[model samples]
Target chain A: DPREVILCKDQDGKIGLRLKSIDNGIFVQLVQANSPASLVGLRFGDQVLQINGENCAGWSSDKAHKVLKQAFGEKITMTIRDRPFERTITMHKDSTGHVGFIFKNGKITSIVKDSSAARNGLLTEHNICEINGQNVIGLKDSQIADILSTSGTVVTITIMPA
Target chain B: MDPREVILCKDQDGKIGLRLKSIDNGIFVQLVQANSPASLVGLRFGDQVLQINGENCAGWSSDKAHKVLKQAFGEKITMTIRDRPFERTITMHKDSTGHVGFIFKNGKITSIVKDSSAARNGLLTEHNICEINGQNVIGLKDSQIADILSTSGTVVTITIMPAF
Candidate 1:
């Protein structure tokens, strides 16, 4: 299938997705950790554009519900857009020397040889998830440059390594 | 014609099998289970729930529909909803099965049948189906998958990420 398919429940219980009706459509509000939904790639901010064949237009939070109830034991087909989220990074100066990469929209544009990122398996197109617990989703490039220009030696970065 | 009728049960799960919404100050059906009675009778968008027994819901509200919906559970009940002016016209059908002698759960291969082609094909039992033809099958049905063996000429191109 070219869409996201979820069995709608966990081994111990129900499917682990919460929904909220928004201005344009119904959105995935929360995904319970350790739930089948989370394990199967359901993420927050993904919109439930349609279910079965029903479009999410002119629907309320209540109307947006119930269809999920339709597929209790079967499969629920959803059209969702996997949204890109922010992440934090922690870097210090040491054996690897410099931090590895730079970005456009949280991913690196290129790679740095022998840098900490190179040793730690960072890639040119890796999605930077977090830096020192601060999300780097919408941060300035200079701000990211500042993080790499640190005074210490150890660096920790959260990346979406696809 | 007026909205057709059907019967649905809560089952062992206690659900009426119809998801509703308040639209234009009237109650409209948003979803119907494919196997459930709501689907058997066939409903459509813009199908307005006009009445529950004698409760004429002309311009009713969402909160008001809940109480009316209660009457239809377990027992067959009748409500009125005008039929949709036009149906959605497109029904998607996918043919041809892929062969990967592995049983899947939520797109994850929970088990691989012994001596199956998938075993010969090097697909691990615990690998999850992340992409098939480059679209995430994370929430797609097993119907849309290409198994290891393949039923026809549809080439299977998928990436199964290992379940750590």
Candidate 2:
């Protein structure tokens, strides 16, 4: 019941959506900016539950591609579930201004024990989507580091469960 | 049964710069970026990967393969691959325009000039020009490749593989 139907129109025979079969489920890995997938609010990590009314839980990349390629209708209807939970955490930076977590490629890979990030239930593998409500998508590691480094004592972060 | 063993060293960014796709239950090289370890080691597009570090990856999922690649230790990762099964050598004579009658950008054949030797010889589009005149010119510049072809006299021998 959490799934929502999204409509997309292909541009130049492509929706500009890239899917990856991860953990036995098809998830949107990339949505090219300004493309149909992006315009319709299809986000990275969104799980494809059904494609044009066909179950795609076990579909491979090739299968999904065939379905999308052969789609003839004016609109391709897809039922998708937004990626795992989104969490916002407010934590106090330590004396040395460390958040007690390490990230690479916008994903929190390690959480330090006994740190504010851990104590506040900030889990690893969650993508740091925003810092103080500023979108951090497509930002480099050093850029994210700079944001976190300059953030004052109290920092609020929004993470998307990947 | 002739699987070639390829050893690749990661770049400073910890990437081999190879993308893989599974089709019909077989994993194949989808793309190899220039200046990447995969390109340096001559990993061509459409090559089937049979094993990674000696582990059979026949039915491995994307995440499983990614996890192995990410967690792989050290610089060198070994893989066993079967060369592109569809690759073939084609011999063609340069047309009056001093060109092979085919156009390629970034080493992939984009179009074929009509009524040219390339078209006569069945030089298909969407194929990667891997070798020219016995030279492995995988990541070479278009002009350099053109120079090679321009100086190859009347006939040019090229090895091409279907781009995945």
Candidate 3:
């Protein structure tokens, strides 16, 4: 299946891609955008079934990362539910490449003084939808930086105006 | 000159001492102490100060009175006490600190649970004097009170002993 891919940056200044589905499920939500899941391809309402060939049922996001780490440098398969379609995708990892994007809660209750978001006319309580085409619905401050880090040049974002 | 010192305490028998001197318009009185001068001199509060060295010391500021008391060392300070119209003169031997424990009005005490010393000593109510093993504390300092309270043991018991 064609996974929704978004570019992200890690702590080491390496650019990476996040894969996610479109349908919402127990492990996926538009709010998941605040997580590394959204930066990769996971979207709000996506149903995740398997990660790295391991069943993701009842698996927490942290558990899924552990499975991902075990499958490093190898071809990993993921099964996702998008609406009425069930699809499988393969991702290849390199030894020197970044695997995950930083996740943060993106609920903007208030904008601090002299903050980047404030300087950009982003108001308090504005829901940040995405940055540079990566979802950030529930991302925190560090997660937002991850997306910005991966931006090779200019980055565009979608936001829900408060 | 000896610095003005005041000692206010509820004696072993639970008597309040309110010693006041108005010297140089400055009021000086002992605020807290475990042993009261009243217990030492057998005097109670509300006893009016009549004379210092046969000179009237009443209505003087506490500072001026303290200075005068300091100057009149070893002199017998006489006082006139009116117990319902009958007045008596008592001569007091002046100490180095001018230790006068005289209460002009009713001595007030406030108790709080947060005060660990008072709480440990069973001082749960206002106007309750704390005693250790039936002996009234002679010189309970704040630090001493805290130390006693911190240790887990019955050190003092409080009782409402009236002042005559």
True contacts kept of each: 0.00, 0.00, 0.00
How do the residues B1-164 of candidate 1 rate in per-residue lDDT, one tens digit apiece?
Answer: 43444444444454456677664334666566656666656654335565555355544566666666764456665655555421211111122333435578767666544444443233444455655554545545677664422433444455554342
Q: Predicted candidate 1: what Cα RMSD to the true structure? A: 23.6
Q: Give the lDDT of residue A98 in candidate 1.
A: 60
lDDT of 2 by residue, A1-162 (tens): 336555556557788888876534577877777787877787766777667766564467988988998998668888776653355677788888886787899998766655666444455567887788676767899999998888788889887656
lDDT, candidate 2, at B153: 85
- Better model by lDDT, 1 or 2? 2
Is 1 or 2 the stronger prediction by TM-score?
A: 2
Model 2's DockQ score: 0.01
Q: What DockQ was computed for model 3?
A: 0.00
Candidate 1 lDDT at A130 equals 51
TM-score of 3: 0.21
lDDT per residue for candidate 3 within A42-144, as digits (tens), equals 5543445555544443344555545555555434455554421111111122232322222235644543333232222222333456565565555568877
Using Cα atoms with residue i matched to residue i, what is each candidate's TM-score against the true structure?
A: 0.28, 0.44, 0.21
Model 2 segments more than 4 A misplaced: A3-6, A85-88, A149-153, A160-162, B1-164
lDDT of 3 at A71: 53
Question: What is the lDDT for A109 in model 1?
Answer: 62
Interface RMSD, candidates in the order listed = 26.3, 19.2, 34.3
- RMSD (Å) per prediction: 23.6, 17.8, 31.5
Better of 2 and 3 by DockQ: 2
Candidate 3 scores a C-alpha RMSD against the true structure in Å of 31.5
Per-residue CA lDDT of model 3 for B48-73, tens digit only, reads 34344444443355566555645543
